[PDB]
Symmetry: none
Subunit: 402 residues, 4 copies
């Protein structure tokens, strides 16, 4: 519904979208404007697909890394908070949503992965990845496991892969050298080899995903998981006595998570840009709107200073920020898209044994060094959801990309 | 689509297509099968576009260099001539139409560019590229120019670009290394600089194309042109007293044109491939059949031994084969269209001043380094000719190439 | 396009097109001219779309009501049969194909809908629409329904809509007043309310279409259907013991179907109009030629006198002509497609509950009041099938209609 | 150039576009952002044509009557002046640019037509239209004429046509009855008949246009003209001693000009919406920016109160506002488009004698009563400037309009 007079909002299924709908319901009450909160699959790839043809939602929620590609494709309206409102949010969150000198999204919350452990099974969890094998051997004799976490999304494995020196793009003086990529280097090989060794040695399963790992931790079947603050409420529900701590170190060096700022952008094709701004600034980015959402699924360390002053006292948030400090804020450059695509394939191929670690990371590097809109776009395009008219605009749009 | 019981043939506009239809009419009269000869513009692009879908002609004529890409795209039937027929043609012409061990077309005639000169204006044509400036200077007084030829198609400029060392792809053993490209080497630079200098120094105009150069020569306005046998008949209609001879040398080395073998491929989707086979084998590739086309526009050095014995007595044909010998048969690899794209841009951009020679030839190199099945097919389609449903099929077809 | 020396024919999918091709094969054997019989979906729309451009078949078969619009768009050749041939067909069938004094098609057969009933389930079929509810009530016990017929095409619902006074356009003198429309009068309302009430009261389902109603009858699941002669052969294959009879009365008045004359028009752009003329005149419109089609699917009451003398002995044909007499030959004016559009929406919207009967029939009226050449052609094209260049031609073609 | 990083501005050729470019030059100097001011032909019909396909300028200048159609077609961004800036402009100018509760453009200036007369030829010009014949008879004996004004644009004749009761749409309580149109009524017939009588009697020429009338007044060939403030600077240049006064009355009732507010909207497809706003609010709508433009071609009675306080003392401005008071502020409803289209045709057809006054105004009414996007759009479409891709989006856009 690219309907004027309405707001349509997209956000990932793991965030507090019932919470957000409650904020929509306060906006409809005060204003009469209906808000529909939807959480469709793969929405970070659908958005650029349908916004290109002037469709999609008024408001898109995602971590900030995808937004520079959006802004570059002219898919986002420039947001114009006054100084009084900008002063409400931590300066480094605004930096994460600035692209080519324009603010292209409102920052909502800072996310980092942490080690979450069952204190009943494991009151003193391991400081190192290298201890996990022996600890799994121990828990196996009891029909349990040391560690389960989503191995389907490179976001979850990247902190291990980066530990010993893997990187996406080289950061120098204020700028990413997109010709300097480090997914194929010795440090990235070391961390992926360690992961694959865990599966080879039957300490993890290659096919473990988000939901398999959540159920296992939440039922008492595995001692540890890796996950971000959004996950904590399902763990409360399970009554498991859990702690949130620093990720284990690897080769005597910290795991270095990629730090994401959940952000909200306004589709540049939206006929509702003023309503979107009123909803975001006046309803969502308040102690009340952030609480509604956070009480649903935890946001992390929110962008809003007044509300953050409270949540910062939560030792789980302390631990999140501790982990964020060891990792790095994601780049928002357009190539992040190619980075994730490449690494996802490499991790799955290495984990399942279809490829060696060496073969996998060298194709991931080759894929990144071969990134260019026209083959790349074809790679992110889902034609099963293109109408003939959308496919034609896309054939032009791709002739011109070029 | 394409209907059974009839043949549709496509052949380029500069070829003897009325001659060709004379052969078709003999065929319908003997056979009861109607032959429709068509000469659509940009056919070497239109072909891959419509044959992809199982439409297009039964028979396609073009120089052999496009046929590798068409065969790789599954568009051509492997042809099936017996040994006795194969014995009738020259083995080198069969090599030009062999792709991964398969015969993908019937060769027709060998085409090389020669220097064509007006014997009244210039009875002793230039041995070297280097003397042409002074000659143009001298012709100016008479209201004439030294030389005009098509600068819009890199085919006509290649011979000079290659003379001092430019090459498409390195040929070491039996193979073409697609990684080792020679459009940007010292010889390619020196050849193109000499062309640009001809333009800078007002001896040629960047804008000159096929029809412009042809009019000027045939109207006795320019002393020389560079063209292939198909042009001789318009010259003859013109009564210009012309000769055909070896291209001039550059830095003391022959001009090296890229030699094409005009070939007929059978569309893989054609229901008439036996009919195609009988027409081509028993009608076209005969003394009688080839004479009818060559009498419309000359074909060059024909592939069929018995007829070439005749043609080869003609000094314009010895001139053609001299140039052919000095140049190189074109590769037929999929990557040739990428080559020709890249070089077409370089020549037009350098001739126009839009780029230096070094800038233009670097960009030609980079482009060839970044080719792939997907983008080559893309260089091939214009969206202006695709329906939305077709575009949607193209998005899938494109995806399957990535 | 369209090639000389051959015929391409389009005929609707529910007709005897294999029979028709049998006539074509006799024609090729006598004539040496190949006949290609095609039955594309939505042909009565696809025809105006491709014939506008001078493409499409040589011959088009449809009921006469579409032929006024096709002739007005300059798409049909005026046919040229001599008096002796014209004497062979019935004068009323020639009137159906006359437009502004010109013969625009050869009539083939008269089509009217009848009540078809299962003689085992219902040996005495209902005289009146009004009794069908109680009959359905009684059939329910047996696991059967009273009546199922296509509710998606207003052709099948019109007979009841017209019974009590609905009409398309008023016919006073010799002419149809396009200003005086009768889709929204008291009789049209009463007829449609009775259909909607059948649905409200669970005696029919809004969703029922051609193939659904056909399966149900032919599988012995429903006692009655409403359909034309073309359906009888599937019923026969079915061994259902069926009869064909007069439609039931409504408010004491005959059902009045809109009677079509299945006709063949010659495409104005066809290069084979003498061949079309010889096939139609001397092959199709013969005892032998019509028997071959009618043996595939029955044609109805054929236009050719000598063959109808035979067919008319068949009680299913007397039933057809009874219904034909009680209903009205369709006008052939350009405005008939607008009529059918308008009523198709009304019936579907009323049957679905989306609109009351009064709302739906008012909107049908308004629509017909607002028709024009431009928007009628628009109801005809789908952009999904137009290339951009074609679309541009359509914008001009459309402008020339305003 | 839908280039981000640039502003492209469209404004009519009769406004001070050299002036406006000087404001662009101050914006480029202070900001580095290039501004291109263009004045293309028929820009009020091109804008909706090219903005529909995401092309056109960042900023469009036109009188406010066209903007409600634009806003309705989703072609305009909502503008969001703060209260401090809105307070700078007269409240009634903001009303003129509000559509469906959104401000859709910045108001610049109020325009009304006045009677401009040569005080040397005619020190006491006529209070009535009915005096013009005798006064022309008098000036003719001297090789001069009473009155010449653009008869090609209904804007110039509408005040006479409305005098005795012609109207576009009936205005009641706060709303236009679009079903109540008055171009065919007795008052509109009376004023058009008077115009046509002037031409019949050789007092005016049907073909006199803007430029013919300007030259004539400006050279001393005609005593009077009708025109808005933009025209006054060319009259200064001519040194003609002119006055600006109330339009003559007709049938003892005032001429009732349609009053236009020159406005500036921001294309909703612009990637430069923030720059556009900075330029409009901060550079143009200042005493300095308005003066730059006004010193070029007079704007009328500007929207900006501080600058208006000065120009209001100009007796020419007093006379403009006197005339505005007798006429009416144009509606901005989407149907204004159809209104002008209809009346333009009627005036030209009546003036040239191809149609009687009665025939002309009744077709204009019939055209208005038949207004609907799909025939209407086809009427405003210029396909000579559509690319194939633009034409396809338009065939969809029009299928959907609907
Ligand atoms: O795995 C690649 C993927 O990782 C990140 O996505 C995170 C997201 O940021 C979190 O909020 C949560 O949803 O987990 C996701 C991983 O499943 C990047 O944000 C995303 O762009 C990237 O593709
Ligand atoms: O200019 C690039 C072009 O060169 C060759 O085309 C020749 C063709 O072989 C000749 O038969 C003649 O028609 O002139 C053409 C150039 O105008 C290659 O065969 C072709 O693939 C390539 O694009
Ligand atoms: O439903 C509207 C439709 O009715 C008629 O079409 C009939 C056709 O005449 C018969 O031959 C048979 O095939 O069924 C069709 C309906 O499914 C009109 O002839 C047609 O123009 C109209 O749109
Ligand atoms: O004539 C119909 C036309 O009139 C008005 O246009 C005016 C414009 O407002 C003035 O600023 C000046 O340019 O003269 C124009 C008439 O030529 C309406 O503004 C316009 O929409 C309408 O079509």
């Amino acid at each position: 519904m690219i309907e004027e007079g309405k707001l349509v909002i997209w956000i990932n299924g793991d965030k507090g979208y019932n919470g957000l709908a409650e904020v929509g319901k306060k906006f409809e009450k005060d204003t009469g404007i209906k808000v529909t909160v939807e959480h469709p699959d793969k929405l970070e790839e659908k958005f650029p697909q349908v916004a290109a043809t002037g469709d999609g939602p008024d408001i898109i929620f995602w971590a900030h890394d995808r937004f520079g590609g959006y802004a570059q494709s002219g898919l986002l309206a420039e947001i114009t908070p006054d100084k009084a409102f900008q002063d409400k949010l931590y300066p480094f969150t605004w930096d994460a949503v600035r692209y080519n000198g324009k603010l292209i999204a409102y920052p909502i919350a800072v996310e980092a992965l942490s080690l979450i452990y069952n204190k009943d099974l494991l009151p003193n969890p391991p400081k190192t990845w290298e201890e996990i094998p022996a600890l799994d051997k121990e828990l196996k004799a009891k029909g349990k496991s040391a560690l389960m976490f989503n191995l389907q999304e490179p976001y979850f494995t990247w902190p291990l892969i980066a530990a010993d020196g893997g990187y996406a793009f080289k950061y120098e003086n204020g700028k990413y050298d997109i010709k300097d990529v480090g997914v194929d280097n010795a440090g990235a090989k070391a961390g992926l080899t360690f992961l694959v060794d865990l599966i080879k040695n039957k300490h993890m399963n290659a096919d473990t995903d988000y939901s398999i790992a959540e159920a296992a931790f939440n039922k008492g079947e595995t001692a540890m998981t890796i996950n971000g603050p959004w996950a904590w409420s399902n763990i409360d529900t399970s009554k498991v006595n859990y702690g949130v701590t620093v990720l284990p170190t690897f080769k005597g060096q910290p795991s270095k998570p990629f730090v994401g700022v959940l952000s909200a952008g306004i589709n540049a094709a939206s006929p509702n840009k003023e309503l979107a701004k009123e909803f975001l600034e006046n309803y969502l980015l308040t102690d009340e709107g952030l609480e509604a959402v956070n009480k649903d699924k935890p946001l992390g360390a929110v962008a809003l200073k007044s509300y953050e002053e409270e949540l910062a006292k939560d030792p789980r948030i302390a631990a999140t920020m501790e982990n964020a400090q060891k990792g790095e804020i994601m780049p928002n450059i357009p190539q992040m898209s190619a980075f994730w695509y490449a690494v996802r394939t490499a991790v799955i191929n290495a984990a399942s044994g279809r490829q060696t670690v060496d073969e996998a990371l060298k194709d991931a590097q080759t894929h990144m060094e071969e990134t260019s809109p026209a083959v790349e776009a074809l790679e992110n395009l889902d034609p099963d959801s293109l109408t003939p008219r959308q496919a034609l605009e896309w054939i032009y749009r791709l002739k011109s990309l070029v």
